Design a protein around this nucleic acid. Structure first.
Lengths: 525, 75, 80, 309, 155, 36, 72, 91, 82, 94, 69
RNA sequence: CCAGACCGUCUCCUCAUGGUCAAUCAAGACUAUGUAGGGAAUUUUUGGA
């Protein structure tokens, strides 16, 4: 009986099917189709991948509502193909398909399903990202390498036969080339406005800066990067960061259905943070903002929104990384906030709310019994023994196992540094500082454990150095701590003359409340 | 001429004895010393003592009296 | 009593209105003017008392009424 | 079925409507509608009719003795807002009022179905007029409930293209241009409350026969639930270079959420054989409002060097 | 639908239609209806029809006083078949219209009521009102009326 | 009309010589009630 | 030196003794928080009707207009 | 934000408004302003059901209203969060 | 602005009667009028509900606690309306 | 303009209105008092800045006893609009 | 905002009648827009003196006869 | 005939917003925009029953 709405329809010979079910239920449904029990099955558009072998395929409504453009966009032909799609299993030498349609979309579907699909390029849209990536690799170091790259692509071998689709009126070996060149130039000259690449005369050199490189690394689009750049500045808040994260081109494939905006609005009463004043409500950004908070606070989402959340989570880990590391590049100490946010995302809990909720499968009923033994941090759970653990948690075995795993791979780490020369401190010199980190246990594998983040993650860290009053970061480095104890060398530029009360952090990218710190003073000349 | 906004300042400065009057009951009247500076009539009064005055010895602690319910001040 | 389906205070200007006060003294008078607080200028005020059974009468004022203590204004009978 | 048109009427519509049928003919066609078979000219109606048909804007192919002509003139009167003394005429006109907008609408629909370009735009205009009771040459400031009378008269009498007013930015300037410095601000406010679409459209061929049309429909106007209503239907017509025949059409609803966003609209069209062989300089995409007068924004869908595969 | 003990009127369950031939007549009737059914708390409004997709104003209303043509128009369209199922009472005022060229409309309506609504299939109560005329048996037959429902009264 | 005056231009469908847009005066006249 | 609202702030997470204008009932409990219009929120609230209690209420909230004074 | 905005929407529905003094008045609400100056078309009364001295038309002053019940047992809540966002179209 | 206030202002130098919350009915000349209805009087009689009537030289009244302010019949139509 | 009142949106959840807000969020019964010897019991549904609340399942307990005696009369009300001036004390019961 | 004209009543003894049957008397020293009358005398009613100067709140001052006209 | 249920068909007052006028050396009446507010705690509508 989970969900209960599947019961009453399915009881009279008409099954239900949508995305993000309890797997067991789905399996049962499938069985009931295969076995010959359920005659009819109602299926959503997202579950065309779940190929249940039917005979007569009905396709009801070729017009899907999406809240990106706030209108009924038609069924793309690929989806239709996928749906039919399913050859006749029971009835041999036969095939039946009913497609319920508009008059406007009749000639569109009547031709491109019976006759082949003319395949064309959409590279002209995403060239900015791709080009940037190429530049970062450094196979492109000029405005002819790009051309060469293009020539080894579908765009260039599709534009010959069908030039009018992409906007080329000449249709010749020269004209086409010229057009391509122009396009390349255009692509470049949006990159140069932002902090992506640099071009100078001596054939002529092209190379990346800090912003391009990060983008290249994480597979994020140009537009998104630009957006991030424009909003993110010094002394920005967590809310602001969240907003920035939400505003991106990666969330164009997160469907806002009919009667979703209202739902979102309703939800907004039971969230910690609020949305900024000078943006839109119907757009996907708002939804993203809402749904990110919907699992920091462990709320009771509908099964439509679960899918959306999952989709968001698919995208965010790169985006959040970018956010944290763009601020680092810029050189501001609100990177800590970003790091914290990232941790939350990885796990699914706030920084101030509760450290004990972090552990897989914890709730407010059992947290009263955890506060009984004066447990504040998660490192106190490592020192506990089995008898007390049993008393605490009275749940199923898998959950317990998961918890144990979490406890184990979550390392107790120590922060110890070793400076080259505390006496000889010169201003504006690349002063190296060897930091010698440590773990409690050496890892078998670096696998991060979290219930509300389904996709798997490998654990990483972030070494930091920055002044608290100024909010100006000096030294940063990401590390993959696979050994038990290592040393790492931050080659950083020393600050201006006089005293500077510097503070190191050892913030993890995954686990909250592992912010080991050690403040110290230096006098620079 | 003494404006009532500068009067507050004066009160704060000197720390004078007071006999505050209430709205509802006529008999029970407070006695103490005003301390606070505020844009409203809301002012804090350390060592408050509510005495029944004729139309007697009833002690009391320390009060911040509400801005609406202050019928009299004296200094 | 004749009084139509009237919308607002502006459409019911210059009408003989009963007016009621906080303590329970009933008035009558033609509504001359409007204001923010409904300080409704009565053309001729005949105040009436009911002791704490039967209603009395007075005739001192042709008044500018004040809003604070008014309960609700009732129409009596149209002019002309 | 929809419009409760008699079969005879439908038949009449079928033949009498044509590819090259003009404003004059539309009226005639309307008159011919079989719901006016029981209508007849009368002697006490006659002087009024005579008076009319001299100063009538839409001319009359038929003459005073014919009932069709009379009907047409009544229609015109209705459009122009003419209440009457001789109420026989007025009674007739009441009938027209109750059923004109219907019949006209039906005709328009039929035209659309057929795919004819000369009638459909004119027909649409006629329908609009019927709906809100005014001409094209009467400004669309009349259909606003709040816009004053003096202003409208001035607008009518100044002899200016309507779109110019819309274009004007500053309220002071607007005030100056109306021959009335008062109410200028109000006018400005209501001009931003009139539909204004910065439309663009990029066509592109998928293959030889089929042609994709990526439309970019922006909506610059500011909403009002009183004046505009629930939503704004804007009937999109893709029509040929001449404006002779319709290629493809679709009704689109501009909601309050859309007005301002960069709203894209995609569609496909299969071409003719001759057309496919040798292709035109540009088609015409045309967005017209079903309610708002003189919105009728039409743009050139470019075909300069669009060589098919 | 409306209960005797519980005085809350069941609004959404029932709907009523009154087919009076003339618009003036309809108007006259509406007022009467309002007068005689204001105690329950019923909205009695003649069909402000206008557009087909706009016609949810009728669904919310309980009692309708339509002109025959208008009624036909309402009932003919696609997304206003939800009304006919909820319409339990179809009153036909002046069924003697049949002899005039208008009353074909009435006949059509009747046909629709019987034949078209078969996927839901729960036939509404049909009450014919009329001036005294002969061939009453035929009329009864047309309207599926036995000797109980037929009430012939002379001048 | 000005024989040497500047005008903006656009692509569109040209109207009839005696189309409603070219004959506003007539409309105005009609509006100014004929049968008083 | 000590203004009114700072005193109030200080008196958060501490005992308060509140009096009403009409229906004069001594409210006793530990203070939680206050706003710019001087409303109150108490914990472990006791409703002393002139010395004698009606009942132990718990977590409560009081409007500013009825309130007379704030003491220990 | 406010719950007087809840009453703004409800046009042409019934109430028996309990006042500060204590009276039951069956009447149609019409337009409720932000100061709660409700305007009743029809009125019943009970002066200090008991002793009836009821006249038809009343314009109520907003200070007198204690308990309003009941035009419609419905719950449609917020409006201003919709408009704040969608007007931000172009910068 | 408020029309009643305007009217009051206009009637500076008129014999205006009064009534307060407690019911003390006055009748004398009007000295001054303001936005907030602050009235001062000259040669003001005091006919209270308690019965102990008195004749006072001057009196100033707080606006908030007034029930109603009397004006004569002369300023009815003109010159304050239009 | 916007921020000067939009910041006051979170002022409910911190100050003395926090408890009532919480109650509203997770509907529970509360004891509501009035000026003229009144006691009212109901659950919370909607809330605003000035305590102009809307409730459900409203039980009223008061006295119309011309003395000396006490008469606790009872009647059920639902979905009221209690004007915020009259409300003195409200509290969440477990 | 608009200042009450109590400059007329400066340096003249006043016989007040505040809210709730309390006849206080005192000479006017200072005034304001709120009507928090800063007066320099207070003798209650028969008669007895309870402190010299008294600053009163605006809400609880209704009637104030000037002794000297 | 034709748009309507995922949707605020309708506002009493102060301020600002820009265009006007009526005007005196820097101030008031009117259309319109809701982008502002209405416990400015005391002169009124949020507490002396």
């Amino acid at each position: 009986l989970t969900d209960g709405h599947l019961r009453a329809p399915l009881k009279h010979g008409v099954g239900i099917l949508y995305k993000g079910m309890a797997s067991n239920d789905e399996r049962i449904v499938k069985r009931l189709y295969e076995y010959g029990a359920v005659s009819v099955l109602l299926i959503s558009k997202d579950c065309s991948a779940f190929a249940c072998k039917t005979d007569e395929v009905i396709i009801l409504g070729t017009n899907l509502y999406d809240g990106a453009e706030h209108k009924y966009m038609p069924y793309t032909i690929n989806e239709l193909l996928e749906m039919v799609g399913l050859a006749s299993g029971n009835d041999s030498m036969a095939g039946k398909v009913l497609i319920l349609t508009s008059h406007n979309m009749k000639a569109y579907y009547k031709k491109f399903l019976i006759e082949p699909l003319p395949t064309e390029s959409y590279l002209q849209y995403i060239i900015h990202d791709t080009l940037n990536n190429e530049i970062a690799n450094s196979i492109i170091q000029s405005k002819q390498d790009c051309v060469d790259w293009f020539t080894y692509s579908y765009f260039y071998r599709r534009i010959h036969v069908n030039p009018s689709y992409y906007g080329v009126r000449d249709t010749s070996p020269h004209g086409i080339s010229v057009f391509l060149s122009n396009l390349v130039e255009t692509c470049l000259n949006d990159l140069v406005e932002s902090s992506f690449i640099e071009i100078d005369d001596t054939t002529e050199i092209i190379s990346t800066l800090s912003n391009g490189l990060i983008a290249s690394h994480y597979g994020v689009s140009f537009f998104t990067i630009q957006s991030f750049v424009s909003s993110l500045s010094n002394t920005s808040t967590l809310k602001n960061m969240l907003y920035v994260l939400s505003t991106a081109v990666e969330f164009e494939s997160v469907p806002l259905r009919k009667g979703d905006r209202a739902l979102l609005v309703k939800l907004s009463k039971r969230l910690p943070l609020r949305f900024p004043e000078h943006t839109s409500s119907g757009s996907v950004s708002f939804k993203v903002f809402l749904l990110l908070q919907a699992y920091f606070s462990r709320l009771e989402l509908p099964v439509d929104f679960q899918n959306d959340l999952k989709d968001i989570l698919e995208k965010v880990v790169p985006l959040i990384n970018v956010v944290v590391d763009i601020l680092s590049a810029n050189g501001y100490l609100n990177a800590t906030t970003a790091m914290d946010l990232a941790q939350m995302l990885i796990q699914g809990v706030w920084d101030v709310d509760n450290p004990l909720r972090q552990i897989p499968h914890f709730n407010n009923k059992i947290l009263e019994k955890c506060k009984e033994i004066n447990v504040e941090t998660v490192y106190d759970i490592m020192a506990l023994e089995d008898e007390e653990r049993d008393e605490i948690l009275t749940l199923t075995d898998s959950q317990l196992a998961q918890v144990a795993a979490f406890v184990n791979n979550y390392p107790n780490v120590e922060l110890t540094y070793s400076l080259n020369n505390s006496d000889s401190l010169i201003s504006g010199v690349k002063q190296k500082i060897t930091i010698q980190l440590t773990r409690d246990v050496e890892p078998e594998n670096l696998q991060v454990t979290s219930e509300k983040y389904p996709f798997d993650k490998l654990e990483s860290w972030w070494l930091v150095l920055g002044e608290v009053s100024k909010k100006e970061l000096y030294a940063i480095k990401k590390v993959t701590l696979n050994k038990e104890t290592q040393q790492y060398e931050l080659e950083f530029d020393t600050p201006t003359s006089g005293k500077h009360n510097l503070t190191i952090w050892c913030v993890c990218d995954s686990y909250l409340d592992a912010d080991k710190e050690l403040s110290f003073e230096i006098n620079v000349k | 001429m003494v404006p009532p906004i500068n009067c507050i300042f004066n009160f704060l400065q000197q720390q004078t004895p007071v006999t505050i009057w209430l709205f509802e009951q006529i008999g029970i009247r407070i006695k103490g010393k005003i301390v606070g500076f505020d844009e409203f009539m809301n002012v804090v009064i350390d060592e408050a003592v509510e005495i029944p005055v004729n139309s007697k010895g009833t002690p009391l602690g320390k009060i911040l009296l509400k801005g609406d319910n202050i019928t009299l001040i004296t200094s | 009593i004749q009084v139509a389906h009237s919308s607002r205070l502006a459409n019911l200007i210059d009408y003989k209105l009963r007016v009621l006060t906080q303590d329970g003294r009933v008035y009558i008078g033609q509504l001359m003017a409007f204001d923010k607080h409904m300080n409704l200028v009565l053309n001729e005020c005949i105040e009436e008392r009911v002791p704490k059974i039967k209603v009395e009468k007075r005739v001192l004022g042709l008044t500018i009424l004040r809003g604070e203590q008014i309960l609700s204004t009732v129409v009596e009978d149209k002019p002309l | 079925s929809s419009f409760y048109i008699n079969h005879a009427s439908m038949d009449v519509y079928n033949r009498e409507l044509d590819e090259h049928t003009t404003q004059i003919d539309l009226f005639r066609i309307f008159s011919m509608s079989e719901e006016f078979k029981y209508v007849s000219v009368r002697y006490e109606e006659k002087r009024e009719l005579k008076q009319l048909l001299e100063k009538a804007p839409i001319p009359i192919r038929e003459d005073i003795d014919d009932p069709l002509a009379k009907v047409n003139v009544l229609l015109q009167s209705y459009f122009s807002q003419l209440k009457f003394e001789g109420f026989a005429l007025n009674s007739d006109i009441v009938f027209i009022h109750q059923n004109a907008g219907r019949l006209l609408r039906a005709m328009f629909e039929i035209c659309l179905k057929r795919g004819w370009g000369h009638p459909t735009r004119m027909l649409l205009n006629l329908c609009k007029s019927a709906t809100t009771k005014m001409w094209p040459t009467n400004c669309p400031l009349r259909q606003f409930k709040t816009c004053p009378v003096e202003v409208i008269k001035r607008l009518e009498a100044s002899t200016v293209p309507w779109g110019d007013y819309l274009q004007l930015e500053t309220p002071a300037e607007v005030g100056r241009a109306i021959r009335s410095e008062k109410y200028g601000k109000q006018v400005y406010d209501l001009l931003k409350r009139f539909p204004k679409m910065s439309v663009t459209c990029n066509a592109q061929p998928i293959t030889r026969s089929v042609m994709r049309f990526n439309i970019e429909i922006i909506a610059d106007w500011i909403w009002d639930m009183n004046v505009h209503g629930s939503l704004e239907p804007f009937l999109l017509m893709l029509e040929d270079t001449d404006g002779d025949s319709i290629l493809y059409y679709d009704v689109l609803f501009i909601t309050p959420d859309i007005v301002g966003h960069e709203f894209t609209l995609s569609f496909t069209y299969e071409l003719k054989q001759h057309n496919q062989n040798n292709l035109p300089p540009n088609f015409f995409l045309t967005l017209i409002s079903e309610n708002w007068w003189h919105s009728e924004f039409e743009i050139p869908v470019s075909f300069n060097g669009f060589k098919l595969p | 639908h409306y209960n005797p003990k519980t005085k809350k009127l069941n609004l959404s369950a029932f709907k009523i239609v009154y087919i009076a031939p003339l618009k003036a007549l309809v108007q006259e009737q509406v007022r009467e209806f309002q007068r005689r059914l204001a105690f329950l708390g019923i909205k009695v409004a003649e069909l402000t029809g206008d557009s087909r997709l706009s016609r949810k104003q009728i669904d919310e209303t309980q009692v309708l006083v339509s002109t025959p043509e208008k009624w036909d128009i309402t009932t003919r369209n696609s997304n206003n078949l939800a009304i006919v199922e909820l319409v339990r009472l179809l009153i036909i005022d002046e069924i003697h219209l049949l002899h005039d060229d208008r009353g074909p409309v009435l006949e059509s309506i009747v046909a629709r009521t019987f034949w078209a609504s078969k996927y839901g299939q729960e036939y509404p109560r049909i009450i014919g009102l009329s001036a005294t005329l002969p061939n009453y048996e035929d009329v009864g037959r047309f309207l599926r009326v036995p000797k109980e429902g037929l009430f012939y009264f002379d001048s | 009309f000005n024989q040497e005056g500047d005008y903006n231009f656009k692509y569109g469908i040209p109207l009839e010589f005696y189309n409603e847009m070219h004959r506003p005066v007539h409309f105005l006249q009609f509006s100014e009630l004929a049968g008083d | 030196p000590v203004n009114p609202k700072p005193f109030l702030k200080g008196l958060v997470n501490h005992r308060v003794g509140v009096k009403l204008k009409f229906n004069s009932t001594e409210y006793r409990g530990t203070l939680v928080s206050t706003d710019n219009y001087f409303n109150l929120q108490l914990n472990e609230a006791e409703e002393f009707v002139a010395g004698v209690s009606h009942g132990t209420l718990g977590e409560i909230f009081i409007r500013c207009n009825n309130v007379l004074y704030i003491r220990e | 934000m406010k719950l007087v905005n809840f009453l703004k929407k409800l046009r042409n529905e019934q109430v028996t408004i309990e006042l500060k003094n204590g009276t039951t008045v069956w009447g149609t609400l019409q337009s409720v302003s932000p100061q709660m100056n409700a305007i009743l078309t029809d009125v019943k009364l009970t002066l200090p059901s008991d002793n009836i001295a009821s006249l038809q038309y009343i314009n109520i002053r907003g200070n007198t209203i204690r308990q309003i019940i009941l035009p419609d047992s419905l719950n449609l809540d917020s409006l201003l969060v919709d408009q704040k966002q969608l007007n931000s179209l172009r910068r | 602005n408020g029309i009643p206030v305007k009217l009051l202002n206009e009637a500076q130098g008129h014999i205006v009667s009064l009534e307060l919350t407690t019911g003390a009915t006055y009748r004398g000349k009007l000295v001054e009028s303001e936005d907030s209805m602050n009235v001062q009087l000259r040669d003001v009689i005091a006919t209270e509900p308690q019965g102990a009537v008195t004749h006072m030289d001057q009196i100033f009244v707080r606006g908030s606690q007034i029930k109603f302010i009397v004006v004569p019949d002369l300023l009815k139509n003109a010159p304050l309306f239009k | 303009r916007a921020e000067l009142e939009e910041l006051e949106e979170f002022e409910f959840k911190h100050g003395p209105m926090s408890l009532i807000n919480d109650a509203m969020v997770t509907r529970t019964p509360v004891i509501i008092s009035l000026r003229n010897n009144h006691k009212i019991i109901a659950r919370v549904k909607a809330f605003d800045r000035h305590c102009n609340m809307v409730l459900e399942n409203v039980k009223e307990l008061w006295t119309e006893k011309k003395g000396k005696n006490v008469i606790n009369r009872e009647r059920f009300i639902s979905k009221l609009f209690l004007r915020g001036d009259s409300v003195i004390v409200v509290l969440k019961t477990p | 905002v608009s200042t009450p004209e109590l400059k007329k009543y400066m340096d003249k003894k006043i016989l007040l009648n505040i809210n709730g049957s309390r006849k206080v008397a005192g000479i006017l020293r200072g005034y304001d827009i709120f009507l928090n009358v800063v007066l320099d005398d207070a003798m209650e009613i028969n008669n007895h003196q309870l402190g010299l100067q008294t600053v009163i709140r605006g809400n609880s001052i209704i009637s104030l006869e000037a002794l000297d006209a």
